[PDB]
Design an enzyme around this catalytic site. Sequence first.
Site, short mmCIF file in Angstrom:
data_model
loop_
_atom_site.label_atom_id
_atom_site.label_comp_id
_atom_site.label_asym_id
_atom_site.label_seq_id
_atom_site.Cartn_x
_atom_site.Cartn_y
_atom_site.Cartn_z
N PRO A 328 -8.64 10.35 11.25
CA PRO A 328 -9.89 9.62 10.99
C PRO A 328 -10.30 8.78 12.19
CG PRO A 328 -8.32 9.36 9.19
CD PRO A 328 -7.56 9.95 10.33
N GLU A 357 -13.54 3.88 7.75
CA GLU A 357 -14.33 4.52 8.81
C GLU A 357 -15.77 4.02 8.80
OE1 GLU A 357 -13.22 6.33 11.31
OE2 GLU A 357 -11.23 5.91 10.48
N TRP A 459 18.40 -8.84 20.89
CA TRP A 459 17.49 -8.21 19.95
C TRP A 459 18.10 -8.15 18.56
CZ3 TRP A 459 12.75 -5.79 19.13
CH2 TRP A 459 12.70 -4.85 18.09
N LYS A 463 16.78 -10.30 15.36
CA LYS A 463 16.35 -9.55 14.18
C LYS A 463 17.10 -10.00 12.93
CE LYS A 463 15.39 -5.01 14.23
NZ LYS A 463 14.09 -5.06 13.51
N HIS A 487 4.62 2.49 20.09
CA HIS A 487 3.96 1.55 21.00
C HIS A 487 4.95 0.81 21.88
CE1 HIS A 487 0.28 2.09 18.51
NE2 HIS A 487 1.16 2.16 17.52
#
Lengths: 596, 98
Positions: A328, A357, A459, A463, A487
């Site tokens: 989309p 959208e 890390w 966490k 990402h």
Amino acid sequence: STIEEQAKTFLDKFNHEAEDLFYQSSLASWNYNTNITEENVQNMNNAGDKWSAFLKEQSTLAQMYPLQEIQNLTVKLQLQALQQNGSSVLSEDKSKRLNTILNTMSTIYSTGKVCNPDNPQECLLLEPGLNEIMANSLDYNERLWAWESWRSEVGKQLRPLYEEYVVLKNEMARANHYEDYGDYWRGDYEVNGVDGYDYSRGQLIEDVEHTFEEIKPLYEHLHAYVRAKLMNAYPSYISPIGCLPAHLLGDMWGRFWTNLYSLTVPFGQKPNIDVTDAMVDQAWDAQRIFKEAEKFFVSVGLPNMTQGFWENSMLTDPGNVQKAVCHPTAWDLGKGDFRILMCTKVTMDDFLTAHHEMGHIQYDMAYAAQPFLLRNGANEGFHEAVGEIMSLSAATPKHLKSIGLLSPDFQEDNETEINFLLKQALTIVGTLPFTYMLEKWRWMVFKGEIPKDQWMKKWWEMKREIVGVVEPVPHDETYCDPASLFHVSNDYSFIRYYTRTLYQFQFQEALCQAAKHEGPLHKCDISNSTEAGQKLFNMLRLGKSEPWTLALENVVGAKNMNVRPLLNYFEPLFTWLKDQNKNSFVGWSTDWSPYA
Amino acid sequence: GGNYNYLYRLFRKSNLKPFERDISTEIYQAGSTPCNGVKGFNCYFPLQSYGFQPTYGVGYQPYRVVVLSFELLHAPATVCGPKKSTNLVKNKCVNFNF
Ligand SMILES: *[C@@H]1O[C@H](CO)[C@@H](O)[C@H](O)[C@H]1NC(C)=O
């Protein structure tokens, strides 16, 4: 002689060609998306290469102006947007090495292939399969094995690449008048113009954690309830004093906990609100879905979409050998051309996707009058926020009954409202602490405070301390765990995925006050509310021409970045969880692990 | 594929007079650096070609415009609108405008 008067002429000369060249590039990309074929590949090639090789000269000439004297704020901002040299501040060999390392990490991360040791003839990809096995199943051995496999055969080669990527990017930032890569990530989120709306890069740095402590109890209640449900399901696999392991969440990286709603459903007796039967029975195709979705948009106050969008844009059924992408997307080709790219089906999920959208299209056309360099949102957290607000306000049972999509004799009660609130929370708040910890770790690793070796232990410990996720199996220092994410090898700033939800409810809250609606915030609806559309559009039409700090003033009256409406939304859930974890402690101790 | 046969002036030193037309292709000098008929540090082309396409949105597509200016100079009038006539009748006292 003059430097600000000729700046206008240079900006006009640049924009006139930039608009049409971007239109050509977008048209080629849309054509290849509609026509997935060899012939349309060279179209995007010759569009994008020309666009880049033309914008390079525009960037080159946009340094002959000493940008410290231009009186006009808009002209100064436009000229600064092009005064940046991008990644052309390093040497040619350094730039080539950076491009090669980004290319190789991007290719490596998209090549997941792990076989079972007993049957080395069946490897699995990140596609449905390996991910599907560990995402939809009730197991502890094979899911943990898959979690290790995706993080061992792929997690070892990303560390050497990321080690050089971090240092090269930080060196580029240092050569780019930036102390680190984090401030370059926040360079866009920095306005130093009008008084009272000045925003610095460190403002967000020291405000993200400032407002984070307020959302801690809301996450802790949900965590305690999920852990209790895991006791109810998994016999003695999680310590009540501590917390649950990583792979048992349902996702590879623990971003979302929605897949775990099946094992944490309070009241499964009442079915969830689904209008698939209503739309299928009443013969609602994709076009009818779009027509009924735009009724809410026109009732709120957003202008109806012009002719041409319904013709040029593809809607449904790619059909024959001529394939189309089903992602989309909203296309703003320019010169008044807007298009959609969807694979619409008869589904409430597709209903909300179409609403999202349409919201994207409306916001894109909102800033149409802006120049080429300013035809964008004020910040990066407004497009997606506006897209999701319509989905939130369309999934309400009141709107569905209003559009004749639900039975008028419905008997909605607090039980189903609580269930829906819990289900929505499992998707919304289940990612905010994870987003915060990931962004903080990225900021720290790009700041250079943590050395190369001290990466995995910090890390894991943070966490465990913040989110409360323990390691099902021990891990060594050579593992590059955060690199195995979408990402992280694509150079994407991830803080943007944090504030927009915090904006969303604020907007919703404001829309709620711009709704004359009394009741719960989740049932608060802006149907038939013209003021809700006008107030939104007054800011939507501004675009990026105005500072986002100033932009966040016509909807919500507080400039301060405080999380007011998120707790207000999950108030019934909070008060039910208070009556739920009465004999079960809320919190975790960073002392229990499945391996020790 | 894109039509670029229509051009419009983007920069000129002075504004146009009422009913004035400029067709000169002299290179504009936006800054203080004169140019010998070529683009340079501060020189740009005054004329820009539109990119009219059938896929263009409303407000960007080409529009044919005709302006009719009526002049009534002291010379004898030449152009006047049509005059309609009715049917003639006979043997009945009537009034007429032959
Ligand atoms: C799509 O591309 C093919 C060549 O791969 C071509 O034959 C066909 O005409 C194209 N279709 C459209 C609608 O452009």
